Amino acid sequence: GSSGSSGRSYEGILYKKGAFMKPWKARWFVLDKTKHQLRYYDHRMDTECKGVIDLAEVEAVAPGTPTIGAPKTVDEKAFFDVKTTRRVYNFCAQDVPSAQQWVDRIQSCLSSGPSSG
Known part of the structure; x- marks a missing residue:
């Protein structure tokens, strides 16, 4: 991170596969490093969070790649799939880099393993 002070975590635009008539849906996600969870609100700062993704439940x-429905803004070198216990998730940032940061972030908080080494 480093870039900007920001809260105690990260936050940026994050789309999700459509899987329906309509294309992907752009939502405001929240990469909480302290809570190690994924909080996305229908609208920037909504009454309450709608859905959570325990990063601790992320396999990797x-x-x-960009499929049908996705935005014609971001590139292919951005989209990143998130594997969890529940199911697979399709996410992508609004930039090739901005995405990499999203990954590194999520990857920076995958699952607890062996310490010391």
Whole structure:
């Protein structure tokens, strides 16, 4: 991170696969490093958070490719899939880099393993 002070975590635009008539939906996600969870609100600063993704339940992530429905803004070197216990998630930032940061972030808080080394 470093860039800007910001709260005690990160926050940026994050879309989600459509899987429906309509294309992907752009939502405001919240990469909480302190809570290690994924909080996304329908609208920037909504009454309450709608849905959570325990990063601690993330198996890993991989840079996927732009499919149908996705935005024609971001590139292919941005989209990143998030694997969890529940199911696979399709996410992508609004930039090739901005995305990489999203990954590194999520990847920076995957699952607890062996310490010391």
